[PDB]
Design a protein around this ligand. Structure first.
Ligand SMILES: [Mg+2]
Lengths: 222, 235, 244, 212, 231, 240, 233, 250
């Protein structure tokens, strides 16, 4: 029997800062126990200061990103070159995804950018288009390895102030882009150690009011 | 006979040109755009004193930020309004935002030339579409059955239009207040109307960023009419 | 293209009349006269066949009176072929109703259905209307004995006595003169034949130029019988009523 | 998942948990399970997250079109039926939805409709839907009165979700509270279950089985 | 006369009057100019207002990053044809990862317009278009007529009084074709060309509309104070 | 399918097929609507050119669309049935989906929408019908009376008439109907409705139909004798 | 949904400093039956592209006709069909990738794995993969089926990352490809000795080599191997 | 393309006439005379084989056609219209009857189906009426022998005897004098030949006259034996020789 779906592995990570957002993903593409490519870009600049990644089945991922990029193009045509805001992009992606509710894009989508107040924004989608604005979201193979670490190190969960013994929580102080990138790199280094589908390279797209910037880092290739 | 989509020797569509004649027979509608809001006003023109005039609905809400006034064969406007409302609501569903006044207007005007041998004839009604969005502020558009729409600082349509437009030419300036616009619509409506203008045979409305689209009470308009009479007697 | 040859069958005149309906009614005015008379104990349908021949096989011939079901019959005035199209549709409607509700179709519901079909041809489709006027004679347990007429416009009305076809003006005046509410079928039979005898364009009214029918509760106990008269039976009733 | 809504003297209380799971894996603790259909109507999220989100914001669009056309607030009866008729068209295709459509109008008063993806539409006073519904029902049934104050009703809804959050493995994270009045719903905050549990344990004296 | 009732009828001399009447709508339209060098292609359009309260009708429409047109005649028809071009440019990019050649874009517009001239019920398009673009063979300028005739040119003009601009471009041909790597001078030549078609009115800040596409220049439209530099 | 544009604009901006549909209404028997303080009365003319008519079964001029709304008309009888059927279906559809019966304005707006649609759809002609739609909104005691016409425009009326010689009876209503004080009882409203028809009708015999609609689905058609008593009392006051 | 009937095994390929190399054997298997021995599975498109196809041969022949039609269609009303507006490897791939994904989305796939190898107008190497699912990816070395498991490890020892490509000559690349084809012949039960090899170079153009054979095979050591454990004779 | 004539080509004129039907009847009037006579034990239908050329083989042109084993048809008017009506009539006898009831339709009902087809060409969009009048003779178990005329309007009438086409007025008068309700089939054939001679100018023999009968069952024409209830067709076309034999007793 023909199985229209596949699993291309990969892990992605979106983190919203105070006036920035990062969307990171490993560059390894796989099927089963084989490596297809050590560098296959997975996070894409879609224009209007929005970055996107649709992780999971790469054919559906590429199709969705392609259709969203196309939606940005036609949004400009139809609405006098108006900038597509991140919230508007998010609602639009819900409809793209739910349009195939009974034959879903087998992907976990994350977009990142800035909201209309200039604050960092990350949106997270399930395969059929349920979505939410989030501060922190890992997706894909090693998501279960990364999220607990982020709960602890970004949101300071289970951390209390020494001397109070559980009475006062560690205060949620804002992280800089350099601080976030450290946590992203350590998340992917740790995921590479313990997950076979994670490795080769890490590509991070950083979104600020100045635009989209890229950073690349080597990961272990075993 | 001859095609419904036929060009005249001058290069104009017969049916579109004839629908424009029907609009000339319609009751007057006036729009004035200011930096404090856009005012829409209409002549109700009840055919008999037994007709309950508050059932005459020639000013209509499309969305919270977009209103619309009509002139001509007003029954034709109902499907245009339905489309406009659907377009406004659909865009909000797809994009989690208000639709641009121009985009709404363009969507309405796309229906216009969908006639032939689609509907059997053009619409016999003109629309003044007034609204506000964050990108272009307060806007007033004139949507015709030709599919063409012009943006206006002020515009009059219907039977008293060329007399009213000449009046709007002299009166409009870029510093008009909302209150000044209200009185100006009332003044020009009173000029071109056959019957004597009051709160029962004329209607006012406005669109502001804060309160959105609002049709004025007859009591509210009656006060503005009294304010108009006194300031005209003031010189 | 094709528009050039379109007569536009479904348009108003400047006076607000439907050209084709009016012209179809003109056509019907040249058809043989049909008469329906409703009495307290039954209905009579009488109709004149159009200038016949001696070689016409009358006993197997039907151009005027048709059975829709066991309770409802029609008299036709106009194009016979058009009438048969509508008659078959009416017969199917009656059976559809009977299958759905397990009860015989009430007379008016059948009449309304056929009349709505006629109406459709006057408003949409660009086809010519049916050049037919019906007299419906029927019985149901709600209103009892009923007479209706419908014409190419799709308009229908209820009657105590009515004529369609030729010389309806003369026929209706004669019916209006001699009709009474307490009248019985045997009296109505005589009125119908007397009216046709006076309004006919033929020299004399004979059995071979007539079709005749009665709907009676003269069926053994609480039930209704339709009787399409045979040529000999029409000849006998003509002698009985003293016309021949 | 645990969602409840109940009618009372002061209107409607809507209370939901915040947890979303994929098997044993806790996908999120910050899920919004109340859908703000419009300023006067609320819907709850249970079953399919996408199905509930998508079709209840779609419902909001239909409600908006209704009041533009009819120049009058849509009834809770009409609003709930638009949704139930829609999902009934899809019956068999595999939609997953269990929701309470909550509103407060002049003609109806406070009204709650349970709407289901197999086409069920039930009007009622108390509804509870999700994996932890049975736990919340216990607290609701034993403490509910029509003459509850807005303050006590809000607490009852909060306490009932906490009961479910504690016992049901697939419920927790935080509690979202809403109070629906005739002039619209009023949000009554997000309440972390971790902090709420210890607070309630101490102040109430409940959960003696748990060491704190 | 007897042969102008529809587009499906030839006259005795082999003419199609409905197409000729559609052509007449372009002549009533406001003037617009197209011209190009070997690096850039420029559109200049005189926008027309209804009166002093009204806006000036937009004349230029972007079809892709590398292509767009200016219109003269029925504006709604230009919207239909430009939308069709947008789709065809888009289909080429999505399916073939390939920017649609300007010449191929002209062929598509020709064929779309032709179908409306041979069938009953329809009508010809009542608009003329000037398409500029930069593709793999450099800068291009096309002139579209609703008869279906599409023509590749160095420069041209359509609309009312377009003959003055067209004669000017015919004189200047050897100069403006050499304006390579200088967008401002090419636009100047276009603004000077369209000036040969003005009477009574002159080019103001809300009157003038300019578009440009070139080697390292996405199709961009200039309106308002962005064209004051060229007035 | 047949797609021909029958309703089109003329050089003077008129749609003649819609205007000729109004001429069909002008030919139709006179219909009148008068709303009192707590009722609406629909009066209808019956042309006495047709006797030997069976009045039990002949289509009555006033039709119930629902238990609380009625519709009368002037113009083509066959056309009116199509509008009545559509209105009745829509009334039940509204109850089924909204769980509330139609308002009189909604039902009017629907019928008027159907009429408009038939003025710019290919292959169809306009309805040769104008309607008077009357009733009470659910749980409301305010009388409602609306009018529609072939073009699809509709409006509310304190009192209105349509059909032949409706110019004359409107003349009467305009001088006899006071808005500040509408017919306070059923009696007064019926009397004013019968009076208005007597300006045009001929004999006050079987030529006048009267239907009274009150709040909470209270609709009743007056008989010949009941109407005849109004006819009698009106002329006895007139002999003075 | 179907099942492949007549099938072609591995297609292998790699980038080198001035272009790309692609290779595939000439066998059309019918299950375990080695049915057809003269099947060309490398199909050149113009002088700048070679499409290598594995999997179902009936679908391969269909794709071959689509590509032939693509060349005809491109030439229509195109004066620069043999110059600036000639088909690029990237155009050909994107078209195929669109078709493959559309077909899988209708649940009626073309049962193939495809590698498009070529050189772009600007001299850039093009090497990208697409299969029956519409999955696409690029890498310095690409291989389908068994080649993915056995050829890639060998080819990656030559070009392990992007920076190794300019250091790799056409002689080293071809040598690596030819060795991989031998290894596949040793170890893939659905392979044949006969194969085709195509080189697309930005300087010397398309070089298409037919009727190549696996040579320099080691078998002599088999004579000493006796029994399966304890047998000495 | 597409048939864009979706409107009626036959419409009522101000006088109430359906022009196209009247003109179709005029075309029938110009047609060659055909006739039908019903006897007690059979029906006869006859017409002239007006050969367009002496080089034409008029035996290949069948004016008298078998519709069912017990029903036959002849016409006056436009031959091509008749030919297609025969094809439709043959098919409708199967599709709307034999495939439902397992038996051939009775004459009156087949006539009704043909009449319906002709009626529809009088009202349907973008067609003209058929330019023929048909005479359909047949037999069935419960109605016995019958003869029907079907006109372009779709109207049909049962006859004892009749004629249509060129000399129908004179022929019908001739038939009125000769017909009685005691005629045997051979008497009807004799009268048919007498009547037909008046409207024929040139040659009058078995090669220029087409004549068929609905009479006794012909087990010799069945093609098989073994089923007692199947006794063979009642329709039989008379041979050139059979006609000439009766022309000596004329
Ligand atoms: Mg490894």
């Amino acid at each position: 029997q023909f199985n229209p779906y596949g699993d291309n592995g990969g892990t992605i990570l979106g983190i919203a800062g105070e006036d920035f957002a990062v969307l990171a993903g490993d560059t390894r593409n796989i099927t089963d126990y084989s490596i297809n490519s050590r560098y296959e870009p997975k996070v894409f600049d879609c224009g209007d200061n929005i970055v996107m990644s649709a992780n999971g089945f790469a054919a559906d991922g590429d199709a969705l990103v392609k259709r969203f990029k196309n939606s940005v193009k036609w949004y400009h045509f139809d609405h006098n070159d108006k900038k597509l805001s991140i919230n508007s992009a998010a609602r639009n992606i819900q409809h793209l995804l739910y349009g195939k509710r009974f034959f879903p894009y087998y992907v976990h989508t994350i977009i990142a950018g800035l909201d209309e107040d200039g604050k960092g924004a990350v949106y997270s989608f399930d395969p059929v288009g349920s979505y939410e604005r989030e501060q922190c979201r890992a997706g894909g193979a090693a998501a279960s390895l990364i999220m607990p670490f982020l709960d602890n190190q970004v949101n300071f969960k289970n951390q209390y102030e020494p001397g109070t013994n559980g009475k006062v929580k560690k205060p949620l102080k804002y992280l800089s882009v350099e601080e976030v990138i450290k946590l992203v790199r350590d998340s992917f280094t740790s995921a590479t150690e313990r997950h076979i589908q994670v490795g080769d390279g890490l590509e991070i797209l950083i979104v600020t009011k100045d635009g989209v910037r890229k950073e690349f880092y080597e990961l272990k290739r075993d | 006979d001859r095609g419904v989509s036929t060009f005249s020797p001058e290069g104009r569509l017969f049916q579109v040109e004839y629908s424009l004649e029907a609009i000339k027979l319609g009751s007057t509608a006036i729009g004035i755009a200011t930096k404090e809001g856009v005012v829409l006003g209409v002549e109700k023109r009840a055919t008999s004193p037994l007709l309950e005039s508050d059932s005459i609905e020639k000013i209509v809400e499309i969305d919270r930020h977009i209103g619309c006034a009509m002139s001509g064969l007003t029954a034709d406007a109902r499907s245009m309004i339905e489309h406009a409302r659907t377009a406004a609501v659909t865009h909000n569903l797809y994009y989690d935002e208000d639709i641009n006044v121009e985009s709404l207007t363009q969507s309405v005007c796309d229906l216009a030339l969908r006639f032939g041998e689609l509907m059997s004839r053009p619409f016999g009604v003109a629309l003044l579409i007034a609204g506000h969005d964050a990108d272009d502020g307060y806007q007033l558009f004139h949507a015709e059955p030709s599919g063409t729409f012009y943006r206006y600082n002020a515009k009059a349509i219907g039977s008293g239009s060329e007399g009213a437009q000449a009046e709007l030419l002299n009166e409009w300036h870029s510093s008009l207040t909302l209150k000044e616009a209200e009185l100006l619509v009332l003044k020009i409506l009173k000029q071109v109307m056959e019957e004597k203008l009051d709160e029962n045979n004329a209607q006012l409305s406005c669109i502001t960023k804060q309160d959105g689209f609002k049709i004025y009470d007859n009591e509210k308009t009656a006060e503005l009419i009294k304010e108009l009479k006194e300031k005209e007697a003031a010189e | 293209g094709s528009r050039r040859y379109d007569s536009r069958t479904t348009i108003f005149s400047p006076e607000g009349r439907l050209y084709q309906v009016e012209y179809a009614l003109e056509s019907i005015s040249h058809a043989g006269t049909a008469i329906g008379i409703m009495a307290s104990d039954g209905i009579v349908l009488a109709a004149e066949r159009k200038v016949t021949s001696t070689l016409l096989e009358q006993d197997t011939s039907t151009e005027k009176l048709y059975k829709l079901n066991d309770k409802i019959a029609v008299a036709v005035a106009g194009l016979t072929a058009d009438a048969e199209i509508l008659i078959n549709t009416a017969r199917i409607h009656a059976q559809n109703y009977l299958k759905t509700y397990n009860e015989d179709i009430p007379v008016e519901i059948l009449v309304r259905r056929l009349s709505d079909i006629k109406q459709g041809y006057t408003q949409h489709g660009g086809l010519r209307p049916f050049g037919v006027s019906f007299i419906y004679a029927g019985y149901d347990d709600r209103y009892g004995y009923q007479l209706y007429t419908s014409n190419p416009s799709g308009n229908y009305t209820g009657w105590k006595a009515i004529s369609v076809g030729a010389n309806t003006s003369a026929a209706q005046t004669l019916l209006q003169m001699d009709y009474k509410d307490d009248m019985k079928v045997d009296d109505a039979i005589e009125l119908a034949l007397k009216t046709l005898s006076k309004t006919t364009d033929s020299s004399a009214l004979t059995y071979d130029r007539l079709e005749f029918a009665t709907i009676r509760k003269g069926a053994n106990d609480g039930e209704v019988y339709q009787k399409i008269f045979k040529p000999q039976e029409i000849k006998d009733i003509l002698v009985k009523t003293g016309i021949t | 998942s645990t969602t409840l809504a109940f009618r009372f003297q002061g209107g409607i209380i809507v209370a939901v948990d915040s947890r979303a799971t994929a098997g044993n894996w806790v996908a999120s603790q910050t899920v919004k399970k109340v859908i703000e259909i419009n300023p006067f109507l609320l819907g709850t999220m249970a079953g399919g997250a996408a199905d509930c989100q998508f079709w209840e914001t779609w419902l909001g669009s239909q409600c908006r079109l209704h009041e533009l056309r009819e120049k009058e607030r849509i009834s809770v009866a009409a609003a709930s039926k638009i949704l139930s008729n829609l999902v009934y068209q899809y019956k068999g295709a595999g939609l997953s939805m269990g929701t309470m459509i909550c509103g407060y109008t002049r003609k109806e008063g406070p009204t709650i409709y349970y709407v289901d993806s197999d086409g069920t539409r039930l009007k009622g006073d108390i509804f509870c839907v999700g994996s932890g519904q049975t736990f919340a029902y216990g607290v609701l049934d034993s403490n509910y009165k029509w003459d509850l104050s807005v303050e006590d009703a809000l607490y009852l809804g909060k306490r009932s979700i906490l009961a479910a959050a504690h016992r049901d493995a697939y419920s927790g994270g935080s509690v979202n509270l809403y109070h629906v009045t005739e002039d619209g719903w009023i949000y009554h905050g997000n309440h972390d279950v971790g902090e709420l549990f210890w607070k309630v344990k101490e102040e109430e004296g409940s959960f003696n089985n748990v060491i704190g | 006369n007897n042969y102008d009732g529809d587009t499906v009828t030839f006259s005795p001399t082999g003419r199609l009057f409905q197409v000729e009447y559609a052509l007449e709508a372009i002549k009533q339209g406001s003037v617009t100019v197209g011209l190009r060098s070997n690096t850039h292609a420029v559109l200049v359009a005189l926008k027309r207002n209804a009166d002093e309260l009204s806006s000036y009708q937009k004349k230029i429409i972007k079809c892709d990053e590398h292509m767009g047109l200016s219109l003269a005649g029925l504006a709604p028809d230009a919207r239909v044809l430009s939308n069709y071009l947008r789709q065809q440019c888009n289909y080429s990019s999505l399916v073939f990862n390939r920017k649609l050649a300007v010449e191929r874009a002209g062929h598509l517009l020709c064929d779309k317009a032709q179908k409306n001239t041979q069938s009953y019920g329809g009508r010809p398009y009542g608009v003329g278009l000037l398409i500029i673009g930069y593709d793999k063979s450099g800068a291009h300028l096309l002139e579209f007529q609703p008869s279906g005739n599409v023509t590749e040119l160095y420069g041209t003009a359509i609309g009312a009084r377009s003959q003055g601009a067209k004669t000017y471009l015919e004189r200047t041909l050897d100069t403006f074709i050499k304006i390579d790597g200088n967008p401002d001078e090419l636009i100047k030549a276009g603004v000077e060309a369209i000036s040969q078609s003005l009477r009574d009115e002159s080019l103001t800040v809300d009157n003038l509309s300019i578009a440009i596409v070139g080697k390292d220049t996405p199709f961009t439209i200039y309106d308002g104070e962005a064209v004051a530099k060229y007035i | 399918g047949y797609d021909r544009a029958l309703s089109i604009f003329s050089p003077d901006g008129h749609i003649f097929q819609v205007e000729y549909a109004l001429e069909a209404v002008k030919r139709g028997t006179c219909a009148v609507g008068v709303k009192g303080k707590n009722c609406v009365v629909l009066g209808c003319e019956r042309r006495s050119t047709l006797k030997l008519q069976d009045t039990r079964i002949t289509p009555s001029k006033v039709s119930k669309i629902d238990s609380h709304v009625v519709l009368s008309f002037s113009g083509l009888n066959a056309d009116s049935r199509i509008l009545i059927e559509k209105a009745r279906v829509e009334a039940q559809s509204h109850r089924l989906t909204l769980e509330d019966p139609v308002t009189v304005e909604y039902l009017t707006r629907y019928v008027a929408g159907v009429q408009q649609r038939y003025t710019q759809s290919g292959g169809v002609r306009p309805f040769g019908v104008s309607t008077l739609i009357a009733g009470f909104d659910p749980r409301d005691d305010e009388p409602k009376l609306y009018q529609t016409e072939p073009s699809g425009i509709y409006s509310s009326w304190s009192a209105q008439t349509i059909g032949r010689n409706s110019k004359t009876v409107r003349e009467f209503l305009e001088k006899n109907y006071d808005r500040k004080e509408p017919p306070a009882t059923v009696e007064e409203c019926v009397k004013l409705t019968v009076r208005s028809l007597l300006e045009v009708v001929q004999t006050g015999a079987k030529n006048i139909e009267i239907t009274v609609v009150k709040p909470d689905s209270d609709i009743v058609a007056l008989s010949s004798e009941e109407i005849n008593q109004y006819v009698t009392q009106i002329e006895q006051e007139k002999q003075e | 949904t179907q099942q492949p009937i007549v099938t072609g095994t591995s297609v292998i390929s790699m980038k080198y400093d001035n272009g790309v190399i692609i290779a595939a054997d000439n066998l059309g298997s019918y299950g375990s039956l080695l049915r057809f021995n003269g099947v060309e599975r490398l199909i050149p498109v113009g002088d700048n592209t070679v499409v290598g196809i594995s999997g179902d041969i009936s679908d391969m022949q269909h794709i071959e006709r689509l590509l032939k039609d693509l060349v005809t269609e491109n030439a229509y009303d195109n004066p620069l069909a043999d110059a600036e507006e000639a088909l690029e490897p990237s155009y050909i791939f994107e078209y195929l990738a669109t078709v493959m994904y559309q077909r899988r989305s209708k649940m009626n796939p073309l049962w193939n794995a495809i590698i498009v190898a070529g050189v772009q107008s600007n001299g850039d190497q093009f090497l990208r993969y697409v299969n029956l699912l519409g999955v696409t990816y690029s890498s310095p070395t690409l291989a389908t089926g068994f080649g993915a498991h056995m050829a890639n490890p060998l080819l990656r020892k030559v070009v392990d990352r992007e920076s190794d490509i300019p250091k790799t000559t056409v002689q080293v690349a071809e040598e690596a490809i030819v060795n991989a084809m031998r290894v596949l012949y040793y170890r893939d039960a659905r392979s044949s000795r006969n194969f085709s090899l195509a080189i697309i170079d930005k300087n010397t153009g398309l070089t298409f080599k037919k009727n190549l054979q696996v040579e320099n095979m080691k078998w002599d050591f088999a004579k000493d191997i006796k029994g399966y454990g304890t047998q000495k004779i | 393309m597409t048939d864009r004539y979706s409107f009626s080509l036959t419409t009522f004129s101000p006088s109430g006439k359906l022009g196209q039907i009247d003109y179709a009847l005029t075309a029938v009037k110009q047609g060659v005379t055909s006739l039908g006579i019903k006897a007690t034990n059979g029906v006869v239908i006859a017409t002239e084989k007006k050969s367009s050329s002496p080089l034409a083989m008029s035996e290949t042109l069948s004016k008298v056609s078998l519709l069912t084993p017990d029903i036959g048809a002849v016409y006056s008017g436009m031959g091509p219209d008749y030919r297609v009506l025969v094809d439709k009539s043959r098919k409708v006898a199967h599709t709307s009857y034999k495939r439902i009831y397992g038996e051939y339709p009775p004459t009156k009902l087949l006539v009704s189906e043909v009449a319906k087809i002709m009626q529809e060409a009088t009202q349907s969009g973008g067609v003209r009426p058929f330019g023929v009048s048909l005479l359909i003779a047949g037999h069935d178990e419960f109605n016995g022998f019958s003869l029907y005329q079907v006109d372009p309007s779709g109207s049909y009438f049962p006859w004892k005897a009749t004629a249509i086409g060129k000399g129908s007025v004179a022929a019908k008068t001739f038939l009125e004098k000769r017909w009685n309700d005691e005629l045997e089939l051979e008497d009807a054939i004799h009268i048919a030949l007498l009547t037909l001679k008046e409207s024929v100018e040139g040659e009058f023999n078995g090669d220029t006259i087409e004549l068929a009968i609905i009479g006794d069952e012909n087990p010799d024409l069945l093609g098989y034996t073994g089923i007692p209830t199947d006794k063979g067709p009642r329709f039989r076309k008379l041979t050139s020789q059979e006609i000439n034999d009766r022309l000596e007793a004329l």
